[PDB]
Amino acid sequence: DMWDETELGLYKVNEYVDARDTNMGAWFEAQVVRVTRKAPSRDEPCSSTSRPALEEDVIYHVKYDDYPENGVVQMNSRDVRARARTIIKWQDLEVGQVVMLNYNPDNPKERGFWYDAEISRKRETRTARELYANVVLGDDSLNDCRIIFVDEVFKIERP
């Protein structure tokens, strides 16, 4: 069974977060409506020395702000974070940074959705500001993609 959890979560009921969609991998604003953990065993404490309960243990149940029709969806803790808020300007970007940026996999020249990405190239020539990144970081990432929206790269918020 699922038990409601009030301590381990980094995000509380009613708080807004960014949540990573389970189908497309992009980040969308959402409201936390419930935080749960798996039920402890009958003869085990909620937290033990062998297995200290951890924030990564919780499941967040969220409702997307712009997709209410999707209903309440369950999120792994790695798929919820504080809303993005700070751009990393062009001059501060570098290879190896992991950022949230805007990319359209189907039409890469055009505006898309917001994905985690690892910068793979960063160079300014007389002709262009070249930014490439491995986009949709995780399984089946899109490697070494040319990024259009080089002035709209966000820092990822971390606890």
Author numbering: 127 to 285
What is written in the article reporting this PDB entry?
We hypothesized that the UHRF1 TTD H3K9me3 binding pocket might be targeted by small molecules with specificity.
Recruitment of the DNA methyltransferase DNMT1, which installs CpG methyl groups on the nascent (non-methylated) strand in DNA replication, is regulated by ubiquitin-like with plant and homeodomain and really interesting new gene finger domains 1 (UHRF1). We focused on identifying binders to the UHRF1 tandem Tudor domain (TTD).
